Ligand binder design. Sequence first.
Ligand SMILES: OC[C@H]1O[C@@H](O)[C@H](O)[C@@H](O)[C@H]1O
Ligand SMILES: OC[C@H]1O[C@H](O)[C@H](O)[C@@H](O)[C@H]1O
Ligand code: NA
Lengths: 339, 346
Amino acid sequence: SIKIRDFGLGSDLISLTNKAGVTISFTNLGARIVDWQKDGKHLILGFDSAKEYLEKDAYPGATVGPTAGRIKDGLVKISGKDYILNQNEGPQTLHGGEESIHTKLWTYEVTDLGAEVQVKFSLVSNDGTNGYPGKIEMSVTHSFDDDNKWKIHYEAISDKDTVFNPTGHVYFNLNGDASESVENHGLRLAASRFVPLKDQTEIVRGDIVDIKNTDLDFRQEKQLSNAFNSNMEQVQLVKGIAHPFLLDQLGLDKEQARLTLDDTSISVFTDQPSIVIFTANFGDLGTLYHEKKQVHHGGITFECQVSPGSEQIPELGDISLKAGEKYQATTIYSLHTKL
Amino acid sequence: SIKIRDFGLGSDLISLTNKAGVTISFTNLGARIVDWQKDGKHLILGFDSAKEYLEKDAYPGATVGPTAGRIKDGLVKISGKDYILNQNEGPQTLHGGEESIHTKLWTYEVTDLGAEVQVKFSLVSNDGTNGYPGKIEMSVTHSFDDDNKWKIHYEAISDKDTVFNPTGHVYFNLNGDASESVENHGLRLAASRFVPLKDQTEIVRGDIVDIKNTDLDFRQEKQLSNAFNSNMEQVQLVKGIAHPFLLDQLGLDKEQARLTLDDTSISVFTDQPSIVIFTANFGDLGTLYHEKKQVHHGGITFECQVSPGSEQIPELGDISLKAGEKYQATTIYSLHTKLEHHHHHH
Ligand SMILES: OC[C@H]1O[C@@H](O)[C@H](O)[C@@H](O)[C@H]1O
Ligand SMILES: OC[C@H]1O[C@H](O)[C@H](O)[C@@H](O)[C@H]1O
Ligand code: NA
């Protein structure tokens, strides 16, 4: 079943319920995921109206871009030329700059396929918007099916050579409550390397590091508290995890990651080469989710994309988008329950 | 009363009914007016769904900007610097550029004041968007009251020195039928001069001309057919009217224009210095409005703003907006009945 309702400020709430009784909700404000629930329990973090996101934290569940992550000094080079993007976190351009795409009302169309329902959100980013060459016509289709697969398919075409590398910023919390650390969940991740951060500014340090046999090797499922109680300078640096992990094997068929709590597990599939993991290291901030004060470590992201820092570490990849080339990305979050 | 419902593609349709029974409705797609009816008759042109605007004509009833009209070669000078804007009409920048603000979903909040209801739409134009320095925090409030006054109030603040001069693109047609020409409407307009256009590209010629005693003199009411039938060069150039009229007396207090058909009149008030009048010179295009093929001359706009061309005719005004400075503009369209005697035939 599909239900559409007013989410506040003119945005809509589109709720989909599959054959299994599982309900996923999205809003056009930022082409985002608002809730995901089973047997009455939220699996992800989310607010109860548009205003909240605007007032509290605009990123949760949002499609962020055009470039996800931090760009040092807001500087990219396009076809040999340097371009300075909007700078919104010191000199860095973070998630596309201020008042970026996650704060806009996207247009959308719903497509009911039966076992599968698609919600296609569309937005045009004007040439020069926040310094980005365009125009860029973007669409993000979030779909939900009877097999409990929530899939995100991105597509884009630009009139000029530009940069493009968006991501989905959903925060998972299998405890169903923000006041509860995710240190009790277990994580498995098919990555033997990561990208260390230079410092508190969170720009990349410059190198690629081997994680095998360290507190960050989740190659073998392991509990989060491990990483959390590690003395590794990198962990201590951010007070948790807030880094890109390079996947060992690329391809949409491979389960790249798994997050488990009891009988409940989320499997991550993507065609992207990297996963950025941030464990809501908010300290005492205490953002309120559903009347619950959020705790340090009260959520975790799986930002699938090309790793931030390719501006200084080219090996990471190349995020350019040539005028006329069609960009495509796919990321999937599969829900499972042991019987 | 106020009613809201989905209008298509994610937009809403906000419908107000005042105490007199007059209904007006807006959509956050382009912070635009969609319809205005009296006794079941449409006083304006509009479509039935959001997709119609996107597929047929995205300008009717829309808020357009950041700069309304054509900027020759998209070139503006801001604080001694030249900036080139998006060029969407040949080398010209028409109505802020391609995929401009009239194409976006604005957020909104409704305030019920009882005798007056306000719909405040908001949008942020990012710095660099279409070439304009910013960011620009914009807001358009559309309000309707028990006195049948539809009012538009614009506010804006930029982080940087930029240019701003938006307008409202409604089209009236008192026949309530697009396939009916407005040549049968009477027009009264407090303007003695106009701005001629250089040629078919529609950029300004460079001079300001006196139109008194010509077929474009509406200081004293006359049927629109007088203009439409005129063979004056400027009229033949655009096949109707499509020019800026310079108001003789400035101020929000003055009825600068009045459009009448039989017992119904629409009065125009504004704090702007000019009214750009475009009489839907589309020839045989025949855009369908409510299933009626629109006719040449099947509608008339009253775009209140600083006249286009100030880049060339500095005398028209200054559309620059300084960083931190608050822009404001107000335009009011008020409806009346039996304001005068208008009994004609065509
Ligand atoms: O505070 C650091 C974090 O900031 C977030 O906005 C970002 O999405 C995370 O991946 C992480 O880098
Ligand atoms: O074609 C000329 C015409 O073009 C557009 O529709 C404008 O909005 C009108 O004001 C007028 O200048
Ligand atoms: Na809605």
